[PDB]
Amino acid sequence: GSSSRRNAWGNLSYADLITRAIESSPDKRLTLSQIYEWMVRCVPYFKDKGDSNSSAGWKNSIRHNLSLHSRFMRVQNEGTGKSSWWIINPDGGKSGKAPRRRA
Questions:
Q1: Which of 5, 37, 40, 54 allows an S-S link to 49, with CB 3.0 to 4.6 Å?
Q2: Which CATH code is given to the segment(s) 1-103?
């Protein structure tokens, strides 16, 4: 039957795993590369996928999960680089591309 309770370590979904890494980060915004490593640090799933091609594999799927609802939001660099950071949307938090000060 359906799993009402799940192991919050191994039975995590892809979105959860991204979150796991992102929450274990400094500013909650990380590139997919740094999410990947931050994940491998604590994740059970991407340990295996860390060694295998499933890294540059399930990472492709992970981005689809970053398109779920509005559960995640994507942040760009303020200028110190031209790369994107990725976060789970808590409210806005990092204010990435969010016009707070319109004046």
A1: 54
A2: 1.10.10.10
